[PDB]
Structures are given as structure tokens and as C-alpha cells.
Design an enzyme around this catalytic site. Structure first.
Site, PDB file in Angstrom:
ATOM      1  N   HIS A 101       1.719   5.429  -1.544  1.00  0.00           N
ATOM      2  CA  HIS A 101       1.521   6.654  -2.286  1.00  0.00           C
ATOM      3  C   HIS A 101       2.850   7.227  -2.711  1.00  0.00           C
ATOM      4  CE1 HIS A 101      -2.804   6.730  -1.449  1.00  0.00           C
ATOM      5  NE2 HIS A 101      -2.463   6.197  -0.292  1.00  0.00           N
ATOM      6  N   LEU A 102       3.036   7.332  -4.017  1.00  0.00           N
ATOM      7  CA  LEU A 102       4.239   7.890  -4.610  1.00  0.00           C
ATOM      8  C   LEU A 102       4.071   9.312  -5.156  1.00  0.00           C
ATOM      9  CD1 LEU A 102       5.933   4.851  -6.469  1.00  0.00           C
ATOM     10  CD2 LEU A 102       6.519   5.982  -4.310  1.00  0.00           C
ATOM     11  N   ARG A 103       2.833   9.826  -5.201  1.00  0.00           N
ATOM     12  CA  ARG A 103       2.582  11.171  -5.738  1.00  0.00           C
ATOM     13  C   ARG A 103       3.066  11.251  -7.205  1.00  0.00           C
ATOM     14  NH1 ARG A 103      -0.973  11.093  -1.719  1.00  0.00           N
ATOM     15  NH2 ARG A 103      -0.046  11.737   0.284  1.00  0.00           N
ATOM     16  N   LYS A 114      -8.770   0.188  -6.575  1.00  0.00           N
ATOM     17  CA  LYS A 114      -8.897   0.778  -5.237  1.00  0.00           C
ATOM     18  C   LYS A 114     -10.251   1.474  -5.126  1.00  0.00           C
ATOM     19  CE  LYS A 114      -7.472   2.286  -1.240  1.00  0.00           C
ATOM     20  NZ  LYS A 114      -6.328   3.203  -1.305  1.00  0.00           N
ATOM     21  N   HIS A 137      -5.129  -0.829   5.391  1.00  0.00           N
ATOM     22  CA  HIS A 137      -4.813  -0.074   6.604  1.00  0.00           C
ATOM     23  C   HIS A 137      -5.901  -0.158   7.657  1.00  0.00           C
ATOM     24  CE1 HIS A 137      -7.353   2.852   4.645  1.00  0.00           C
ATOM     25  NE2 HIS A 137      -6.397   3.370   3.896  1.00  0.00           N
ATOM     26  N   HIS A 173     -10.452   1.189   1.038  1.00  0.00           N
ATOM     27  CA  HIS A 173     -10.354   2.110   2.143  1.00  0.00           C
ATOM     28  C   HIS A 173     -11.749   2.116   2.785  1.00  0.00           C
ATOM     29  CE1 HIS A 173      -8.888   6.015   4.043  1.00  0.00           C
ATOM     30  NE2 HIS A 173     -10.094   5.772   4.531  1.00  0.00           N
ATOM     31  N   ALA A 183      -3.865  14.751   5.747  1.00  0.00           N
ATOM     32  CA  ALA A 183      -3.706  13.416   6.311  1.00  0.00           C
ATOM     33  C   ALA A 183      -2.628  12.613   5.593  1.00  0.00           C
ATOM     34  CB  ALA A 183      -5.019  12.661   6.264  1.00  0.00           C
ATOM     35  N   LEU A 234      -5.549   9.089   7.706  1.00  0.00           N
ATOM     36  CA  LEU A 234      -6.792   8.306   7.640  1.00  0.00           C
ATOM     37  C   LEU A 234      -6.475   6.848   7.300  1.00  0.00           C
ATOM     38  CD1 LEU A 234      -8.981  10.888   5.707  1.00  0.00           C
ATOM     39  CD2 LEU A 234      -8.646  10.655   8.217  1.00  0.00           C
ATOM     40  N   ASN A 290      -4.574   7.762  -6.426  1.00  0.00           N
ATOM     41  CA  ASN A 290      -5.256   9.009  -6.044  1.00  0.00           C
ATOM     42  C   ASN A 290      -4.409  10.241  -6.389  1.00  0.00           C
ATOM     43  OD1 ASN A 290      -3.459   8.408  -3.954  1.00  0.00           O
ATOM     44  ND2 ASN A 290      -4.655   9.405  -2.377  1.00  0.00           N
ATOM     45  N   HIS A 314       0.821  -1.225   0.000  1.00  0.00           N
ATOM     46  CA  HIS A 314       0.000   0.000   0.000  1.00  0.00           C
ATOM     47  C   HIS A 314       0.851   1.270   0.000  1.00  0.00           C
ATOM     48  CE1 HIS A 314      -4.023   1.959   1.341  1.00  0.00           C
ATOM     49  NE2 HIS A 314      -3.192   2.938   1.027  1.00  0.00           N
ATOM     50  N   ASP A 318       1.086   2.538   3.754  1.00  0.00           N
ATOM     51  CA  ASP A 318       0.341   3.735   3.475  1.00  0.00           C
ATOM     52  C   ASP A 318       1.222   4.960   3.593  1.00  0.00           C
ATOM     53  OD1 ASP A 318      -1.896   5.077   2.530  1.00  0.00           O
ATOM     54  OD2 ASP A 318      -2.701   5.416   4.549  1.00  0.00           O
TER      55      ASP A 318
HETATM   56  O1  LIG Z   1      -6.639   7.598   2.825  1.00  0.00           O
HETATM   57  C1  LIG Z   1      -5.547   8.154   2.978  1.00  0.00           C
HETATM   58  C2  LIG Z   1      -4.998   8.919   1.788  1.00  0.00           C
HETATM   59  C3  LIG Z   1      -3.513   9.210   2.030  1.00  0.00           C
HETATM   60  C4  LIG Z   1      -3.026  10.237   1.052  1.00  0.00           C
HETATM   61  O2  LIG Z   1      -2.600  11.357   1.455  1.00  0.00           O
HETATM   62  O3  LIG Z   1      -3.037   9.932  -0.148  1.00  0.00           O
HETATM   63  N1  LIG Z   1      -3.314   9.684   3.388  1.00  0.00           N
HETATM   64  C5  LIG Z   1      -3.939   9.088   4.404  1.00  0.00           C
HETATM   65  O4  LIG Z   1      -3.739   9.489   5.547  1.00  0.00           O
HETATM   66  N2  LIG Z   1      -4.781   8.088   4.112  1.00  0.00           N
HETATM   67 ZN   LIG Z   2      -6.623   4.829   2.498  1.00  0.00          ZN
HETATM   68 ZN   LIG Z   3      -3.461   5.041   1.121  1.00  0.00          ZN
END
Ligand SMILES: O=C1C[C@@H](C(=O)O)NC(=O)N1
Ligand SMILES: [Zn+2]
Ligand SMILES: [Zn+2]
Ligand SMILES: NC(=O)N[C@@H](CC(=O)O)C(=O)O
Ligand SMILES: [Zn+2]
Ligand SMILES: [Zn+2]
Lengths: 343, 338
Positions: free
Chosen positions: A15-17, A99, A174, A136, A263, A219, A41, A13, A247
Site C-alpha cells: 500500500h502506497l496511498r 485484487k 497475507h 484478501h 488497521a 487485517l 484501495n 503486496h 502488506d
Molecule cells: O486489508 C488490509 C488493508 C490495509 C490498509 O490499510 O490498506 N491494512 C490492513 O491491515 N490490511
Molecule cells: Zn488485505
Molecule cells: Zn493489503
């Protein structure tokens, strides 16, 4: 000093942006993990095969010479996604999974899901072709207390969905509650979960006693201690359908430390050693490798990595911050002395 | 169009800080409130008559000409405080009350300060209580309710003549406790604990400007507090707990607790009472109930609130950094006339 040698892990899980931030954060993942589930996302979200291919290439472009790292792409489920587009991406090896983010009736159809019922065609298609659904699992209705949103999701969406689509494979991402821990523990071979290092290491008191700490704000929200303990006991049990998912979710310092902090914890740099510390404290290091390197592959039907890495139990200092092109990133456990580090 | 004329209010729970911050924040109080209970948690705290005298003068120095404002000083209780110092300050009209802050210079137990509390009970000095336990393994959202069972009720059972204000209550537990109490127990409630619950601090982002102690609780508690004030119950009264911190002390990796609500509290309370169809009880909460509990006369002047939308400033200038007011950049439905 003591050494833990494990098959090279993967991060189920992540996030690489994109853009410059991607360029900065990717190495923290690619130096350590063989593969990662790359969440979709972005702005705008990755909802087509073409976008995912292009994004995959941008990630690959940013991997330092000699790192053996493979991004496993995902599709962001939306009301307007064509099930034929998801299926083609799965068939072509582009989408490893899809997702599902929380539903909101007010969401634009191009950016999300209004209700789960509204995307049944696409969920049926994933069931049919054997594509795993990553969830999620929160309900985000304004009248639901934030600490209740995960539990409400289990009752309102997760159990009904799995009853409706009995062949659907699902990762409860998560997880943060005893509710979800028990639920996943009592599930079948088609139900798994990821757990982040922050939800094992901390509870809501760590985010709120003595001050408010936006770098622990993520989150789903950190829950009370009873929930933390349930998560810890779950991974420590050797239960084999829970696995590593950081995450890791990076935001610029000024976006974290603001009047409305974003978050997400940037934990890619310190996650592996943080999990080792948790497994050690739980007297459950015999289950550590499986969590990091075996359970995920097994659930996804993918091979376990054949190379090894070593963690050493020698103290190191986590950076206070990590420079971005503009602003800086504050890593998880910034400035702290950590117990386990990668050799 | 709509105008609401009330007896001039008082603020029975205020933080005015010191130095340049004091100079900046006092006028937001002094322009409106006749009196305020000035809390003693300075660094170092106000634990002597001499310190309280000098602090009172620094406060008066910062009050604009033409504001009739009187600060009512308080003593910060410590484990070793001499009861005679407290009584002396009382007798000299310096200390109006004493404040009990649980450690984490605060009080480590009620047992350590029994002789001080016994003197207060004898002399009729009210005890203002920050009612939270602080043991590391008690969840933050449980700390108020735990205090009631483990400290408040034993204390009140032991010193049955002691007058207690349960400051800034945040829970149904405390609301019911106070509602069912006797005439020697009262409470203050902030605007933020009436207007919001913890979702407002945590959903959609983390909002440090809503972070204060006692922490915002779940909605069922917010509703209990709103019902309590709306009921007309006459031993609850206005205490803002206006607690200013510079912006980048709020917006940091470890944000300070407290809302700077002095600029917007009165209007905010009016909105709540109106929403609760309870404006008939609004004056008493603002301007009568406190004086009655404290045994002080009501104010003899009057002010007007008008239901005309005012925009709250995004920030207020400090010598260094800014101060972000409660409801910064938002709209308040009621404003104070002139
Ligand atoms: O659901 C999420 C999204 C993630 C984010 O920033 O992409 N950050 C979080 O804290 N959880
Ligand atoms: Zn999430
Ligand atoms: Zn996530
Ligand atoms: N309430 C707060 O969150 N802050 C107050 C302290 C207090 O009233 O306990 C402060 O002085 O900053
Ligand atoms: Zn307090
Ligand atoms: Zn206070």
C-alpha cells in the site's frame, strides 16, 4: 560482521496511498525493491485503466532520482467493473493483477463486491486470459468471530472458487493461519501466498498482553501462536509458492492511536531485515533469497532481478517516527534495535 | 414511559483511583450505589490498615454532600503480607475483603500466601480473585480457563471453608464453574462482558475503550454469561470493574486496560436483563445477591430506572486530558430517574 547478499527483492503486496503520504512512503520501498504490487484501495478505488495509469505516474513522480523501481498496478474488483475494462488493462500492461477484497452485500457496486457469485463474469475473464487474482481471504459476516474469518473463507469461497474455475491463478494474500498454510502447501501450481513480517514475528499476545498495541493491529488479525508457528515453518520449509509481501499499510499516528484505530502496519522501512531475522531463527537462510527474490517472479511469470543488495548483521535503531506533512508515521518496530539492516 | 423501581444497588467491584481522578469519578458511583467494594491496586497498593484508613477518608472527602455512600475497603494481597495485619484490618471494620491479583506487587503463588488465606478462611473474610494465569506462553484468551484448572479448584479444594468471589468472569468455563459451585463461591460480571464480545473491540477498527482485563472473549462466552445472569442464579452479582484511565493513556501505542463504566453501567445492565426477558431477576443481581454473599444487610432505599433514551457524553473533563466514558457518544435505553 555477517553479510547476506541477495538478488534485489520485490514486494508482492504493498500500500502506497496517494498525495503527500505517497510522497513520504514511496522511497522506503523504491530504495530497496525492484518492483512492487501496488494495491488499489484508494478513496475512491482504482477500478479503471485511466485511474491506474494516472496513479502509476504519481508513484513514479515520487521515486527519488536513481532508484530503479517499477510499480505493478492492480484493479480493485467491484460488482460494476466491466470485464472488458479489466482485460484491456491486462492486455495493455497496466494491470498486473486484480485484487478481491471481502464481499459485503451492503457495499456500493462502485466500491466493492456483494458476493463472489455476482462477479463470476469478471473472474471467468481473468481465468481465460491468465490474469492472477489476489485475494484478501476473509468472510466478514457480523456473526463470524474475527479470528475465524480466514478459515471460513477457505471453506466457503476459496475452495469452491478454485473448483469452479480450475485454470484461475490465485495468490492467497497475507496468510495468517495454519489453515491457510496447510491449504496453500497442499495446493497446485496455480495457488500461491504472501506472508507479512508481522505475522511471522508476532502473535495476538504481542498485540494484547501488557496493553493494547494499535501498531500491531492489522487485517487479517494476528492469530494465536500455533498459527504463527505454522507460517514460520512454511517459509522455512523452502516451499516455493510463498513469497515476500509486506502488506505495508501506513496510517498517520493520530489515526492509529485513537478511539478506533485503523488497521495496518507501516513496515516497508524494516520488513526485509525482519524477514532475514525470521529465516535466521528458523535456520532456513538458504531459503531466504528465493522468498524475497525468486518465488514471486516465478509465479507471476516475470524475470528475476539481476542486481544485488546486501544485508549486514549489525545492530541499528529504528526511528521512533517519520514526519508527514501533517502528523507523523510510526514505523513497524519503531524505536527498536533490529538485527539485520541493509548495507 | 416504562419505569422500573429497584432497591438501591451496590457495586461489588470498583476502581476509584486516587488524587484528582478520584475526585472526578467518585460522584458517578456515590450518586447511585449505596456501597462499593473499593479495589486496592493503587500505586503503591493498599496493603496496610493505615493506608486503607487514609484512602477511605480521601474517598469520603470526595463524596458530594447528600450522597449516602460507604466505600468497603480491600487489602491488596502480597507474598509477604502479615496475616495479623489483614486480620487486624478486618476486626477494626477497615477491610471488608482481600484481593488476589496474579503477578503481572501481586501474588506470585497461592503457596507463598497460604497462611494469609488460612487466616481469611478462619475469620470468614472473603477472597476476591482476579482469575487469570500470566505465563508468557499462555494465550491471553486462555488465561481465565487455565486459572480455574490450575489455581482456583486446587485452592478451593484445600480451603473448603473459604468464601471466594471469582471477579469479572468472562467465559463459559467460569460461568459453568460458578453455576456448579457451592454456596461459598460467587462471581461478579461487568456490563461490557454482557454487552459485547471481542468482535466489538476488533472489527472495523481497534477500540481501546473496550480493552480491559480479563479480555473480551468470543461470542459463545458472552452468551454463557448472559444466560447465567438471566437464569436467576443468585451467586452472581453486579460488579462494574469501572476502571478509569485518562483518554491518551487509552489512546496510545500501548493502551491501558479498563472501561470507565460507572456512568452507564446500571442502565446497561437493565438493557441486558430486558433483552434476556429477565427483568424479574434484575433487582437481585443489583441489590440482593451481593449483600447475601457478603453477609451485609440489603439497602433500605429505592431508585427508579426509566426507559427513556439518554445520550452518553463524548468525554468527561479532567484536570489534564479527558476521560472517555464507556459508550461515549452512544445511546443507553435506560436512565436513572432524578
Ligand atoms: O486489508 C488490509 C488493508 C490495509 C490498509 O490499510 O490498506 N491494512 C490492513 O491491515 N490490511
Ligand atoms: Zn488485505
Ligand atoms: Zn493489503
Ligand atoms: N480490568 C481492567 O482491565 N483494569 C483494572 C484491573 C483489573 O480489574 O484487573 C484496572 O485497575 O485498570
Ligand atoms: Zn481484575
Ligand atoms: Zn478490577
Amino acid at each position: 560482521s555477517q553479510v547476506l547478499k541477495i538478488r534485489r527483492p520485490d514486494d508482492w503486496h504493498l500500500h502506497l496511498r496517494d498525495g503527500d503520504m505517497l510522497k513520504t512512503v514511496v522511497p522506503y520501498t523504491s530504495e530497496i525493491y525492484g518492483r512492487a504490487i501496488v494495491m488499489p484501495n484508494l478513496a475512491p478505488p482504482v477500478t479503471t485503466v485511466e485511474a491506474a495509469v494516472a496513479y502509476r505516474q504519481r508513484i513514479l513522480d515520487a521515486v527519488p532520482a536513481g532508484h530503479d523501481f517499477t510499480p505493478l498496478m492492480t484493479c480493485y474488483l467491484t460488482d460494476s467493473l466491466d470485464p472488458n475494462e479489466l482485460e484491456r488493462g491486462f492486455n495493455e500492461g497496466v494491470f498486473t493483477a486484480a485484487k478481491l477484497y471481502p464481499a459485503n452485500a451492503a457495499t456500493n457496486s462502485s466500491h466493492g463486491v456483494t458476493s463472489v457469485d455476482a462477479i463470476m463474469p469478471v473472474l471467468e475473464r481473468m481465468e481465460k486470459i491468465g490474469m492472477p487474482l489476489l485475494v484478501h481471504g476473509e468472510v466478514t459476516h457480523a456473526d463470524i468471530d474475527i479470528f475465524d474469518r480466514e478459515a471460513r473463507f477457505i471453506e466457503s469461497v476459496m475452495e469452491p472458487l478454485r473448483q469452479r474455475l480450475t485454470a484461475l491463478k490465485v495468490v492467497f494474500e497475507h496468510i495468517t493461519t495454519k489453515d491457510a498454510a496447510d491449504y496453500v502447501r497442499d495446493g497446485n501450481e496455480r495457488l500461491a501466498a504472501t506472508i507479512t513480517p508481522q505475522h511471522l514475528m508476532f502473535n495476538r499476545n504481542h498485540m494484547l498482553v501488557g496493553g493494547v498495541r494499535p501498531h500491531l493491529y492489522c487485517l487479517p488479525i494476528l492469530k494465536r501462536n500455533i498459527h504463527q508457528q505454522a507460517l514460520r515453518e512454511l517459509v522455512a520449509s523452502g516451499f516455493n509458492r510463498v513469497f515476500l509481501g509486506t502488506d505495508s499499510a501506513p496510517h498517520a499516528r493520530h489515526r492509529k492511536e485513537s478511539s478506533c484505530g485503523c488497521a495496518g502496519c507501516f513496515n516497508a522501512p524494516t520488513a526485509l531485515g525482519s524477514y532475514a531475522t525470521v529465516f535466521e531463527e528458523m535456520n532456513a537462510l538458504q531459503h531466504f533469497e528465493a522468498f524475497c527474490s525468486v518465488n514471486g517472479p516465478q509465479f507471476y511469470g516475470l524475470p528475476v532481478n539481476d542486481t544485488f543488495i546486501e544485508l549486514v548483521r549489525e545492530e541499528q535503531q529504528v526511528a521512533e517516527s517519520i514526519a508527514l506533512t501533517d502528523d507523523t508515521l510510526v514505523p513497524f518496530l519503531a524505536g527498536e534495535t533490529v538485527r539485520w539492516s541493509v548495507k
